[PDB]
């Protein structure tokens, strides 16, 4: 009783709010898809992570996610923040409705209330206090750019996109086809992986990028194969699918056409190996190069097919011949992975 | 030429000398002298609390010196400060790096630290007047992930890392006061002294080292283990410590005897020990296993006193309240279980 009765109620309320925000967190989290990017060496695995109709809608998403938080947290703070302009009243109410709705169209009406709000001295007063409550990193940037985002012809500049970025220097969460991804780059770790590799058992896919031209050098290709087999056989990683990027296509082609360094030296079983029957060589590609390429691919495949369990799959690819875009490949491969997750779950596979 | 040969020869001999010097002190076994002592008997605990605030797998937790509140970190990027009694949420701190391999609670309960694959130790002030808990100071000197860490006080803080080294920092200055090196693998865990004079650590070299906070050098190296040492905990009096390992056996090492006194294992346990800790008296030795269970051993007789049924996934972390009134275990199922 006494004051204690009130204190219990206090901790009760605080816990309530925390519960709320957490409820908001579970949705976005479960909506996200975590990926683990790794490679042995000289694979430029930092480049893939280094590298526009949706981007606009994303920017707008951020802007709204900002304004809503600002106007919402005004009265929730200890000294609830008053607007200097009461005439913006119904404009706040509006923002207090639209928040947390799926596939919002952001009508021309919205930008008026939002901009006019960002004009309100009380709202800004609320933002200057943002350090105490939780707000998205990029707010003032996009909140100052509202009028610019208004335009139907709006075409975000490179510099304007750089702020749309989520995170640790290695950590990346990027948006593709309206599907959240959160990648992690392990290049900031030493070469003993057994302890930290356990960190992702929940990762939807492990992006494994190995140089196809490394078969010579030390035979780093065999090392990559080893690392792969180990990843594939680990008890904690048994359920994780590996999206495989075979890099340095051009370099492989060069080495192969040259002839000095022969795969069969480091992979004798290649001499008895013929290019796959379904092989679809690209224009201007010597059948020898195609054969070697497919031999490596199959070298990584035989391990994935060794288990025979079907809990996970390995999706091979060829890249770095030319940069282009592997994000879409990754996307589709993830879609397949999850589709087979549900499929296998139902014994439909 | 042939200098390195002489060096390795002297090193081998030294190893032999230490081996024998230890073999000499070995006149008895802790098992021998505890033989007559009445056992703990089979006695099991129960779950008084189940704390669910976590979206993802919990990688670690810590008890507040107040014996009430407790800190827990999860792969979901959230750091939750709970209240064991009321099972409420005192705090929720969003991390920058979603992958967090450890956290610690300051002795004053004022600050809370975390760390992980980000290679950085984030200190958060809980006493902030202006508002909620925001990052107070983040310390990155590390070339590898942060496995473990502990507060000496509200100023300086010790951490261990996959970088192969342990380091004592100074939060205010933001730099490293001292650096401990010489582990041959990732340093998975550490344990301070009651007096914070010195601290041990387990690592992936299958050996635990005992360091000194002032000197910055390793005084003693204990090796009983076959595989990596996942967790390490001090004995209440400070003269010994326990270690879990992937060899699936916990080991007790005495400092003054400079050797392993006893091994806690079972023919039915092939899985490594993720975490360990003692009870108030130090009679019980608790260890979490990959098996999802939690084994309660007898730090003297070597027999398992009991077990904790529990989480449907591997138990990541384990702790015992400073007043030894309760036990807490985090797992990969996002749930914390408090036991009595």
């Amino acid at each position: 009783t006494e004051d204690q009765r009130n204190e219990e109620k206090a901790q009760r309320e605080a816990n309530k709010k925390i519960e709320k925000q957490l409820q908001k967190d579970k949705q976005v989290y479960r909506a996200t898809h975590r990926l683990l990017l790794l490679g042995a060496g000289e694979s430029g695995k930092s480049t893939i992570v280094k590298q526009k109709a949706t981007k606009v809608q994303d920017i707008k998403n951020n802007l709204k996610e900002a304004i809503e938080t600002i106007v919402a947290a005004m009265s929730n703070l200890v000294p609830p923040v008053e607007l200097a302009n009461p005439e913006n009243q119904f404009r706040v109410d509006y923002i207090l409705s639209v928040m947390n709705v799926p596939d919002f169209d952001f009508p021309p009406e919205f930008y008026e209330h939002a901009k006019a709000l960002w004009e309100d001295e009380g709202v800004r007063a609320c933002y200057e206090r943002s350090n105490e409550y939780q707000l998205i990193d990029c707010a003032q940037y996009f909140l100052d750019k509202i009028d610019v985002i208004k335009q139907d012809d709006y075409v975000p500049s490179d510099q304007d996109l750089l702020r749309c970025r989520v995170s640790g220097i290695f950590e990346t969460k990027f948006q593709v086809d309206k599907v959240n991804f959160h990648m992690f780059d392990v290049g900031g770790q030493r070469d003993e992986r057994r302890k930290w590799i356990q960190c992702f058992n929940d990762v939807t896919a492990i992006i494994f990028v190995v140089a196809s031209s490394s078969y010579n050098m030390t035979n780093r290709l065999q090392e990559a194969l080893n690392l792969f087999k180990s990843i594939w056989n680990n008890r904690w990683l048994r359920t994780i699918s590996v999206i495989l990027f075979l890099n340095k296509q051009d370099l492989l082609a060069e080495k192969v056409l040259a002839g000095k360094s022969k795969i069969e030296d480091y992979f004798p079983e290649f001499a008895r190996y013929t290019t796959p029957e379904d092989a679809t060589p690209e224009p201007g590609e010597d059948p020898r190069v195609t054969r070697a390429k497919y031999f490596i691919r199959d070298e990584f495949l035989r391990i994935s097919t060794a288990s025979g369990d079907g809990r996970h799959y390995c999706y091979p690819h060829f890249t770095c011949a030319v940069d282009t875009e592997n994000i879409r490949r990754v996307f589709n491969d993830c879609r397949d992975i999850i589709q087979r997750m549900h499929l296998r779950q139902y014994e439909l596979l | 030429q042939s200098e390195l040969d002489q060096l390795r020869q002297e090193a081998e001999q030294l190893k032999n000398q230490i081996r024998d010097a230890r073999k000499a002190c070995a006149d008895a076994t802790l098992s021998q002298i505890t033989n007559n002592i009445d056992p703990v008997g089979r006695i099991q605990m129960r779950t008084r609390r189940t704390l669910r605030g976590h979206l993802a797998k919990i990688y670690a937790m810590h008890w507040g010196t107040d014996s009430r509140l407790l800190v827990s970190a999860s792969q979901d990027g959230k750091l939750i400060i709970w209240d064991s009694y009321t099972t409420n949420k005192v705090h929720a701190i969003p991390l920058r790096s979603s992958w967090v391999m450890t956290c610690a609670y300051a002795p004053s309960g004022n600050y809370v630290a975390c760390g992980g694959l980000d290679n950085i130790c984030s200190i958060y002030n809980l006493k902030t007047r202006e508002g909620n808990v925001r990052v107070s100071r983040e310390l990155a000197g590390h070339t590898g992930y942060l496995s473990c860490c502990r507060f000496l006080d509200d100023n300086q803080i010790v951490t261990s890392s996959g970088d192969t080294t342990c380091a004592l920092w100074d939060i205010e200055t933001g730099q490293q006061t001292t650096t401990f090196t010489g582990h041959t693998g990732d340093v998975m865990s550490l344990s301070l002294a009651p007096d914070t004079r010195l601290f041990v650590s387990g690592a992936c070299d299958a050996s635990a080292k005992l360091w000194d906070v002032r000197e910055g050098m390793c005084r003693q190296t204990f090796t009983g283990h076959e595989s990596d040492i996942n967790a390490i905990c001090f004995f209440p009096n400070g003269n010994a410590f326990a270690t879990g390992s992937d060899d699936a056996t916990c080991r007790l090492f005495d400092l003054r005897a400079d050797q392993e006194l006893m091994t806690y294992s079972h023919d039915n346990i092939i899985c490594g020990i993720t975490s360990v800790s003692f009870s108030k008296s130090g009679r019980l030795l608790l260890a979490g296993y990959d098996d999802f269970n939690c084994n309660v051993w007898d730090a003297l007789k070597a027999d398992r006193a009991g077990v904790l049924a529990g989480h449907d996934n591997r138990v990541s972390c384990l702790g015992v309240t400073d007043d030894g009134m309760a036990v807490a275990t985090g797992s990969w199922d996002s749930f914390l279980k408090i036991w009595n």
Partner: nanobody, 128 residues
Framework: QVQLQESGGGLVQPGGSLRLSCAASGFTFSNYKMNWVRQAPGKGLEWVSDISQSGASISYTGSVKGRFTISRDNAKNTLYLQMNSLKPEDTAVYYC?????????????????????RGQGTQVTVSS
């Protein structure tokens, strides 16, 4: 403790043969997957041949294929690599290193230096 001492090895004329032996101790040899790792002159370590606890699953590097046969004695806690038809390219330091975890398939050794369970190794040289 845990230690692996590579013995044998030495100078051999090209085409010849050399049999590497490894004494293991400080752990139960039966539960660990074993392997041989070599380091060529001034170059990073490279995996050579592995053998499963059971003595069943056995792998060799592409090159050593048919020229190298790895055999383990469990009861005697020892590892064996029979090297035949040695070539001048085989000259390197052979360490016998065991997987970190007991009762397993995978391995995360063959780290450049900085690996807990690996021998100091032996020097195998092929004369020209």
């Amino acid at each position: 403790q845990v230690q692996l001492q590579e013995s044998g090895g030495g100078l051999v004329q090209p085409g010849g043969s050399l049999r590497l032996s490894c004494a293991a101790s400080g752990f139960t040899f039966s539960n660990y997957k074993m392997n041989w790792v070599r380091q060529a002159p001034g170059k990073g370590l490279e995996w050579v041949s592995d053998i499963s606890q059971s003595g069943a699953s056995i792998s060799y590097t592409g090159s050593v294929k048919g020229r190298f046969t790895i055999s383990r004695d469990n009861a005697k806690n020892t590892l064996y690599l029979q090297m035949n038809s040695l070539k001048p390219e085989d000259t390197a330091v052979y360490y016998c290193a065991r997987c970190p975890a007991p009762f397993t398939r995978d391995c995360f050794d063959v780290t450049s230096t900085t690996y807990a369970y690996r021998g100091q190794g032996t020097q195998v040289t092929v004369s020209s």
